[PDB]
């Protein structure tokens with residue numbers, strides 16, 4: 001395995017982001033003088049997460065640097081994203097800096113990554129602002145591929161009693177445990193809303209237990225202040241009850257590439 005490397009190549013620092021990420025550590029890869037992120041350690045899931053990261057490559061997907069899978073503790077070496085997660089980044093930013101153009105740019109990058117996954121027949125299953133990472137100059141990458149899967153059909157069935165982030169999860173996924181690229185499209189809609197609100201929590205003040213009933217009744221979050229109408233329209237298409245009525249990531253991406261360029265012209 002070309003991805004396999006010597007653990008002693010890495011000097012292990014403190015846990016990343018005060019522990020919010022689970023067991024993931026800042027580390028220094030000494031040879032290359034490089035700060036990296038190291039995921040350590042059922043290991044069954046852990047190892048497949050690594051095999052997946054070896055299959056996917058894209059400028060907006062967090063890149064695998066290497067692994068030590070041969071003996072415990074197991075390492076998963078991932079590129080270090082200097083600004084941390086998108087949620088905290090949106091909350092803490094200077095909005096004059098991270099403005100309407102930047103928000104468009106973020107959606108374009110993320111949708112670019114999802115269009116690539118869609119074309120490859122993968123699903124992510126954990127899309128959300130907390131799972132995106134931010135680099136210099138508002139570079140954004142999707143991370144956390146632990147639940148990512150290469151599909152054999154058009155649908156994937158989570159194991160019985162698996163539990164999900166209710167406010168990001170598509171109705172068919174909540175009810176039937178069925179995931180598809182369409183379910184990702186739904187979650188991407190929630191991510192857009194997180195972006196438009198600079199990291200507000202979705203369905204504000206609405207208790208988790210009532211969310212599914214509301215969706216069945218075709219309640220959807222309102223258009224965030226300052227959110228351009230075209231973007232709200234996309235959100236609403238993402239939240240269609242029928243998965244087959246949700247746009248593809250190819251379409252979503254094209255819509256953002258268009259908006260982003262027109263905004264850059266101004």
Ligand SMILES: CNC(=O)c1ccccc1Sc1ccc2c(/C=C/c3ccccn3)n[nH]c2c1
Nearest residue numbers: 017021022037079080081082083084131143144
């Ligand atoms: C087990 N958990 C994950 O794999 C996971 C889940 C959600 C989001 C990310 C990750 S893995 C991860 C975590 C942090 C990073 C970073 C840097 C994090 C950071 C950097 C500055 C300040 C605060 N946090 N670079 N690359 C990373 C990869």
Ligand code: NA
Nearest residue numbers: 125126127187
């Ligand atoms: Na999801």
Ligand code: NA
Nearest residue numbers: 157158159162
């Ligand atoms: Na599962």
Ligand code: NI
Nearest residue numbers: 112253254257
């Ligand atoms: Ni593109």
Ligand code: NI
Nearest residue numbers: 115250253254
């Ligand atoms: Ni494209």
